[PDB]
Amino acid sequence: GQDRSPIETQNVETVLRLFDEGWGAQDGWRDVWRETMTPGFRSIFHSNQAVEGIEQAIAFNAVLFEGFPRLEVVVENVTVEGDNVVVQARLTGAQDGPFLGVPPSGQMVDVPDVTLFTLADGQVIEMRYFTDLLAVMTAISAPP
Amino acid sequence: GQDRSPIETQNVETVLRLFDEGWGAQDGWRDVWRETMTPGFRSIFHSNQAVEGIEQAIAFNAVLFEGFPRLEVVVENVTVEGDNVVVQARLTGAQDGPFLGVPPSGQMVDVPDVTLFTLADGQVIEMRYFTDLLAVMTAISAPP
Ligand SMILES: [Cl-]
Ligand SMILES: [Cl-]
């Protein structure tokens, strides 16, 4: 296969930091987001309207991680073409905090996901996200 | 940017047929699937267990399209690296048939999606899918 261009490989390296030092379960992630994303970064969660601005997008991510404060991510595919990087991962952890209106249940989740990044001049400008959110909401809303 | 390799561009061309002549709203799509996918093709819908085998996967797709028989797709991003092709699209149409246990409601949906293909030797061997299925189920289950 054709090797990644220099820009492609740097784009990947930059994005992959968001799954380690910049992962919301890791202390210090916000500063990694601030060094990686542009100020006008836009975050898109499933079909929700974009959250516009880096601090706004950080705040939104923080809310998600209150629901799953120990959430683990395992990257299992990276695909890059130019300034588009696609990361597929699996998420595992317990819903030990409030999440999208559901009180903490302690349920375990184990789901695939996909994050679709756009970069410009080495910085992340947009992130689109999907998981199996219906399965997550069903699992955590399930009666005792 | 670095141009697509010959294999990458052929992979894209092959996959994109699934969004036109091979789209489940289009008469004759099954035969397009049969010429594009391998017999052991695996289909993965959100976090559901894989549907294994081309006829099984075709049957599953057919069920989905009974719910949205006129569903329209507009491709809006294609990203390829080697034998991985990622297609983001938007879907629009009415739930005029039964869908995942919900009787036909006639609701309109308008959602982004992402399909993640793996190919081998020019044929599609696996397809992973996500949309905002929670939003779809919420929209179509909504009281009158
Ligand atoms: Cl932090
Ligand atoms: Cl057909």
CATH number of the domain to which B1 belongs: 3.10.450.50
Residue type, A24: G
| Candidates B8, B83, B116; nearest CB to A88 | B116
Nearest CB to B5 within list A2, A48, A134: A2
The three-point CA angle A49-A54-A58 to 5° equals 80
Distance between alpha carbon B7 and the CA centroid of its chain, in Å? 22
CB B133 within 8 A of CB B46: yes
Q: CB A128 to CB B88 under 8 A?
A: yes
One-letter identity of residue B78: V
* Token code pair at residue B67: 């719910």
Task: Write the CB contacts of A27 (distance below 8 Å, at least 6 apart in sequence).
Answer: none
CA proximity to B63, closest of B92, B7, B102, B35: B102
Which value in Å is the resolution of this experimental model? 1.4
The C-alpha atoms of residue A11 and residue A119 are separated, in whole angstroms, by 7
User: A81 to chain B nearest CA, in Å?
Assistant: 6
What tokens were used for A140? 């955590």
Beta strands in chain B (DSSP E): 37-45, 51-52, 72-81, 84-94, 108-120, 123-131
When scoring B11, B111, B130 by the number of chain A Cβ atoms within 10 A, the one with the most, hence best to mutate, is B130
CB contact (8 A) between residue B132 and residue A133: yes
Report the DSSP pairing between strands A37-45 and A123-131. parallel
Number of domains in chain A: 1
Where does chain B have alpha helices with state H?
A: 6-16, 29-36, 54-67, 133-140
Vertex A101 angle, CA A100 and A106, to 5°: 80
Rounded alpha-carbon distances, angstroms, from residue B61 to A15, B21, B44, B48, B111: 33, 14, 11, 14, 18
Place of tokens 């793996």: B118
- Structure-determination approach: X-ray
CA pair distance B81, A82, nearest whole angstrom:
10
**Nearest residue on chain B to A84, alpha-carbon basis:** B79
Domain of residue A40, residue span? 1-144
Asked if A117 contacts A126 with a C-beta cutoff of 8 angstroms, the reply is yes
Residue to mutate among B134, B137, B141, with most A CBs inside 10 A, is: B134
- Among A47, A84, A133, the residue with its CB nearest the CB of B77 is A84
Distance (Å) from CA B26 to ligand 2 centroid: 7
Q: Provide the shortest C-alpha distance from residue A113 to chain B (in Å).
A: 8
3-state SS record for chain A? CCCCCHHHHHHHHHHHHHHCCCCCCCCCHHHHHHHHEEEEEEEEECCCCCEECHHHHHHHHHHHHHHCCCCEEEEEEEEEECCEEEEEEEEEEECCCCECCECCCCCEEEEEEEEEEEEECCEEEEEEEEECHHHHHHHHCCCC
What residue type is assigned to position B10 of the chain? Q
Q: Calculate how close chain B gets to A31, using CA atoms only, in Å.
A: 29
Between A1, A5, A128, which is nearest B2 by CB?
A5
* Strand pairing class (A123-131; A84-94): unpaired
